[PDB]
Design a protein around this ligand. Structure first.
Ligand SMILES: Cc1cc(CCCCCCCOc2ccc(C3=NCCO3)cc2)on1
Ligand SMILES: Cc1cc(CCCCCCCOc2ccc(C3=NCCO3)cc2)on1
Lengths: 245, 296, 242, 57, 242, 99, 57, 49, 49, 48
């Protein structure tokens, strides 16, 4: 009664028989915005079930040489579903998330993925190699939406910070000999009650292989990793027309 | 009269669940006596890192321990304790001959990410709220003290930024200025937490413009206006050439600090202000290196 | 005026002096402070969080930097071979620098408390094995074999569902605090050595990899505290920030 | 009397500071309350378990 | 004398420092203060007073400066034409500068609160018409048509005895306060856009002018406040006062 | 036409939520707004010249000679108050001299 | 004791200031009472009407 | 500011003057003092040996 | 104008007049003019013993 | 990616061999006559 679990939100239900408990980001469940914390004077929309549900957005293939991937969050879920819509029509957005990364293999396979939540995950460039050029990461890299982006220098999280310390962040590992999925529940985290789901990304989801995937030849070599996230306590205010970016 | 799912609908709970509470930690935890334990079923030493929680194994269950009354304090590891230490954050030149800042005045964009020591410390956390004490040490490039009168003026974003030593903005009718002789002890001032956000943000993953976001504009990624506090202007108080080359060192000391969301410590060298770029070719390891894991 | 006599120290600017100062904005009222997740109160809250210990701080090829995070363990052909070894000193150069604890130490002159190092095994489910992790207190030279290492504080780790095992490095010191240990003379403050030996052997069936890795994670115990803060040495930039 | 305008306003921690101006943000950093919450970062787990137990039942 | 140690900041003259000072005239007693009408206590009392918004800030001929105060509206020949448009930002360059609110903002770094903009119709009594005033929050690009504009906060104004209608521009922001919005980067603090479309059309009988004007007046709502004052930018002289 | 500002509340113009506005209004008071030192007079005592040689000067106390400060006060018709005058003296180079 | 000679003498507002001289006009500007009266400039109307009503009956 | 008049002796550094001084390490807490044999309190304790 | 900086064992010891360690972000420094009365400071019993 | 927008369930293989998918009664009408291609596809339940 700790390795098996079921997550049910909206009209979606995730099952898992090898999970390793659930992490609750910074030990705080997602809440709605207080009356004294808010400033936007208009009564917000709380679609509830139409947006607070499990969107299974992407699948990556883990290979004996994969570097790792990340997904910026507020964004990843735009354009997809009713959530996407409310995020485009409204200026202000607010919401916590239930992230469930899954990836299974056999008892004869081995490997270990680090799954973390890095708030305000600002990306940096290699500065033209030498460090004299003041380059900047492109829209395609800082806000990749679904499909995420692949890391080029995971050791420093493409941002000059050691991944060795990335665990001071809500994390969970996917050790194949132990489990087959991670489950983080992040609350809304920003220095503001609401912000634009479009141009600001509250945090990134990191999935990095720290202990390389490996298996004797002959065992199914296609080992996918699938991301499934679900917004929680979604609130929207500041209604205008629909906006893409 | 209602529809039930509406009477339940916990939608609108403004209070956060928690799960964890804050306890008093004036001293380090004491060590209580331990004895041998030879039993099946209880395995403290065995953990599962996958969960994502740090091992909760106590020294007591790992070895027979004595009793120790730990009275060591934890006061020096608080935030005010750690961060409330003046440090260099800005430097300004007012040379006689040159191209940097002649004309006798300078406009320093208030950005504390220009000096590696102080920068790394704060970049430990994502958000930070606090008041600060700014001190300004001025003198000539030789460290020589000179009888010169300066004027430091804090210019909030929107106020008219001085265009010359004799600019009209130096009337400073609402901006707060400080007049000081370089012979007087360094000017020092108390600054409140002035920001439209609730905390300064060291890292802002996103843009502020809201437009197209082409190549030429990637300059703005990571630029959060809630930290642009305006500029700090200084000028020798006069109509003519200063007569002496000056330098002003700006030291900031935080106080009444609140920090949130700790993140990994800067691993590589810093290259630019408000931009975590790193040397692609010179990516050095976090620490030292040996010749083999089996030798020291 | 009221008679006064200024004492030495007058006009001096002391970095760490905590006094008052004329406020620039009269009647200013800061933006209300919203409620924000994960607030920190004391750095010690961070020192208890486990971070990856680069026990295998050997590779530097820049294309192999990622393999410092874990060390290997594979089917041996003998008895009691040595897997890995490292200084159990936190504020010293070495594996401990990749940790969050290591880094925060660089900011404080001295510390005290027990340390914990959890070792997670990432091999296949089919792989069995018993390792012997041993912490050898000060004065004890790096053990030449298992039979010697075991004479100090140790723990026999068995591979099972519970992937990882934690080795507690109890605060065993002559002094109440320890300044950072650093080779010459200051090796007086050394914590000791940690060595990992093969209690039995890494066993595997036909079909599973003949070699897997262990990832080390470390932090400080509840009785850990630090005092007298300074600046870090571990790092200092080169070029001036553009 | 004194404006209540420091950064640690309404905070859950109690500070004892010295001040000579109307604005409280001018006041010293001062001595303060020593509380902590390691579990927020060390044990942010939904279902706590004990050390004595086997983490994965 | 009593032992003292002067701290940094000594002898500095801080403009906004509020302390005491030796009084020049001992025992001086000021002229009694009579009772005088219209005393002010807080600038916010002034920010709630409506002043003319120069929506039509186009003419500059110096002989046409007076026509900035009002914009026109006349019998259209189609459906949903665009009458006027403007930035709903107060401390920004544009129409809001002709207002009293606009001007007081120039003196404070940040603000918060809802704004109100009353539109008075000055056409003939015989003229009918329904306009659609629409405030489009941040991120919303200037609407291309009425059907798009209406998706945001709006109000259908009908011409009748009640000459004017007020459009409330509610405080809809991500931040608690807003620093002045100004094109580059600081457009982060933009309030949004206001557009006026023809809900129906300006109707008139034979004998009445085929074109009339609307005068806009604006101010701040009761929840409006400003903080951190600076000097205005909007203006600065050139020649020195003779 | 009446001559009064619209009294329409946000609440009656759109469906609104509840907001506890604790923002202060202290910084917008008069003492708050006006009690900030500003330049109002400037006096020259040059060695060679025609302005003020002989070593003395008579400045007519009139604060309307400097545009920043002037505009602020000209916001109101009448004004009663005490004031703190500060005098910053030095040579034209901003150099401090034993005089 | 202290001369009562500041500019805000007899005023309806209450100020709390600090002073070291006999004359009260030397005293600091100080913190003070926050009252307001918008209607004096916004609604100087003789017969008030409400928002709910049609301004011209 | 509060009216003061500095008296002679100002700025002088008197070796044996016992006054206060800004402390370099805020919140610093010294190593507990263990119990140690043969503590001295007054030099006169030594003059009698 | 001088700058005195206490550098605890472990902190980076300045290698030049313009060294980076003089940013003194956590070390306690004292800035003094030789014309100001001698700088004076209070130091606690800082030792692991 | 499109299918998941409706009611679903991620099934994981383990000791518990089977998983059940509940097809909730989601209909405009109180009852459904048998659905059959022409016109009566009005009564269709949906797709799995
Ligand atoms: C008198 C007087 C006082 C002054 C200076 C007042 C300075 C107040 C500064 C507050 C700075 O807060 C900051 C927060 C964040 C950042 C930052 N830089 C990169 C992004 O974050 C910089 C400063 O000038 N004159
Ligand atoms: C010592 C000492 C102090 C002084 C100067 C005292 C100045 C007191 C000045 C009070 C000024 O009040 C004013 C009111 C109105 C105007 C004004 N100028 C244009 C019309 O209104 C100027 C000053 O000189 N020596």
């Amino acid at each position: 009664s700790d390795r098996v679990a079921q997550l049910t939100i909206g009209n979606s239900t995730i099952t898992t028989q090898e999970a390793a408990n659930i992490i609750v980001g910074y030990g705080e469940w997602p809440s709605y915005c207080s009356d004294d914390d808010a400033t936007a004077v208009d009564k917000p929309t709380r679609p509830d079930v139409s947006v607070n549900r499990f969107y299974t957005l992407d699948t990556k293939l883990w290979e004996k040489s994969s570097k790792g991937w990340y997904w910026k969050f507020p964004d990843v879920l735009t354009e997809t579903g009713v959530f996407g819509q409310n995020a485009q029509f409204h200026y202000l957005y607010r919401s916590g998330f239930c992230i469930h990364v899954q990836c299974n293999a056999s008892k004869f396979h081995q490997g270990a993925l680090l799954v973390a939540i890095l708030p305000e995950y600002v990306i940096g460039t290699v500065a033209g190699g030498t460090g004299t050029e003041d380059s900047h990461p492109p829209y395609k890299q800082t806000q990749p939406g679904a499909d995420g982006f692949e890391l080029q220098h995971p050791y420093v999280l493409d941002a000059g910070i050691p991944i060795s310390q990335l665990t001071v962040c809500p994390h969970q590992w996917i050790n194949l000999r132990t489990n087959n999925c991670a489950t983080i529940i992040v609350p809304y985290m920003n220095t503001l009650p609401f912000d634009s789901a479009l141009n600001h990304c509250n945090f990134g989801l990191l999935v990095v292989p720290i202990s390389p995937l490996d298996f004797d030849q002959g065992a199914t070599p296609v080992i996918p990793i699938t991301i499934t996230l679900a917004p929680m306590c979604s609130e929207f205010a500041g209604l205008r027309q629909a906006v893409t970016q | 009269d209602r529809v039930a799912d509406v009477i339940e609908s916990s939608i609108g709970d403004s209070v956060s669940r928690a799960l964890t509470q804050a306890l008093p930690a004036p001293t380090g935890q004491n060590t209580q006596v331990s004895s041998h334990r030879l039993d099946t079923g209880e395995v403290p030493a065995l953990q599962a890192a996958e969960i994502g929680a740090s091992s909760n194994t106590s020294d007591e269950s790992m070895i027979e321990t004595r009793c120790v009354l730990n009275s060591h304090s934890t006061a020096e590891t608080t935030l005010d304790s750690f961060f409330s230490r003046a440090g260099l954050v800005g430097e300004i030149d007012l040379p006689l001959e040159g191209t940097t800042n002649p004309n006798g005045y300078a406009n320093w964009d208030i950005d504390i990410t220009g000096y590696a020591q102080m920068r790394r410390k704060v970049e430990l956390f994502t958000y930070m709220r606090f008041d600060a004490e700014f001190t300004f040490v001025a003198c000539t490039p030789t460290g020589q003290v000179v009888p010169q009168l300066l004027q430091y003026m804090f210019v909030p974003p929107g106020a008219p930024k001085p265009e010359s030593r004799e600019s009209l903005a130096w009337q400073t009718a609402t901006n707060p200025s400080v007049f000081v002789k370089l012979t007087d002890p360094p000017a020092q001032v108390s600054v409140p937490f002035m920001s439209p956000a609730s905390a300064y943000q060291w890292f802002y993953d996103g843009y502020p413009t809201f437009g197209e976001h082409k190549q030429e504009k990637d300059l703005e990624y990571g630029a959060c206006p809630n930290n642009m506090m305006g500029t700090f202007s200084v000028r020798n108080v006069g109509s003519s050439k200063s007569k002496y080359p000056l330098v002003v060192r700006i030291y900031m000391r935080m106080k009444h600090v609140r920090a949130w969301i700790p993140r990994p410590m800067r691993n590589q060298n810093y290259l630019f202000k408000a931009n975590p770029n790193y040397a692609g070719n010179s990516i050095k390891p976090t620490g030292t290196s040996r010749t083999a894991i089996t030798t020291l | 005026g009221f008679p006064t006599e200024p004492k030495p120290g007058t006009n001096q600017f002391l970095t760490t002096d905590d006094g008052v100062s004329a406020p620039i904005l009269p009647n200013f009222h800061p933006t209300p402070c919203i409620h924000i997740p994960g607030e920190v109160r004391n750095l010690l809250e961070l020192c208890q969080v486990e971070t990856i210990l680069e026990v295998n701080n050997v590779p530097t090829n820049a294309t192999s930097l990622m393999e410092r995070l874990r060390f290997p363990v594979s089917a041996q052909a003998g008895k009691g071979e040595l897997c890995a070894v490292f200084r159990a000193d936190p504020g010293r150069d070495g594996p401990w620098q990749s940790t969050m604890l290591g880094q925060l130490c660089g900011y404080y002159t001295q510390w005290s408390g027990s340390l914990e190092v959890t070792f997670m095994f990432t091999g296949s489910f089919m792989a069995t094995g018993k390792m012997l992790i041993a912490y050898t207190p000060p004065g004890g030279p790096l053990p030449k074999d298992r039979a010697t290492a075991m004479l100090g504080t140790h723990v026999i780790w068995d591979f099972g569902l519970q992937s990882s095992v934690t080795l507690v490095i109890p605060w065993i010191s002559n002094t109440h605090y320890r300044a950072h240990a650093r080779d010459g003379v200051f090796d007086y403050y050394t914590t000791g050595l940690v060595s990992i030996w093969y209690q039995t052997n890494y066993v595997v069936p036909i079909g599973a990899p003949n070699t897997a890795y262990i990832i080390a994670l470390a932090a400080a115990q509840k009785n850990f505290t630090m005092k007298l803060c300074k600046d870090t040495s571990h790092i200092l930039q080169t070029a001036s920030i553009q | 009397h004194e404006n209540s305008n420091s950064a640690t306003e309404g905070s859950t921690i109690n500070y004892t500071t010295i001040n000579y101006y109307k604005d409280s943000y001018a006041a010293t950093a001062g001595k303060q309350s020593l509380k902590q919450d390691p579990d927020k970062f060390a044990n942010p787990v939904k279902d706590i378990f004990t050390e004595m137990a086997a983490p994965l039942k």
